[PDB]
Amino acid sequence: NRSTALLKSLSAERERWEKTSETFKNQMSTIAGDCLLSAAFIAYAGYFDQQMRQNLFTTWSHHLQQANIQFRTDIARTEYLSNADERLRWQAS
C-alpha cells in the first residue's frame, strides 16, 4: 500500500514530535528564570559593550543559580529570543 510507505516515511517526524512532546514539563518549568535573564538583558544591556554585556549576563546567571531558579544555560541569547525568520530577514536588511 502507498499508505504504508507514506507512514513509514513519516515515522521519523513522528518520533521527532513525540520526543519533543515528552519533555514539555521541563520545557515549560524553566520559563521563569530564562525570561528573567532575557528581560533584564532586553531592558539594560543595550548601552554596554561586549565585555560588559557578558559580565553583566554572567552576574545575572550566577545570582539565579544562587537562588535556585530554573533556567537553561546553554541557550544563547539571540538564539533564545530571535527565531530563524527574524534573523534571516535582518540579514537580508
Alpha carbon distances (Å) from 83 to 2, 5, 6, 15: 36, 33, 30, 23
Å resolution of this model?
4.0
Q: Identify whether the C-beta of residue 80 lies closer than 8 Å to the C-beta of residue 38.
A: yes
Give the SS3 label for residue 82.
coil
> How far apart are alpha carbons 48 and 58 in whole angstroms?
14
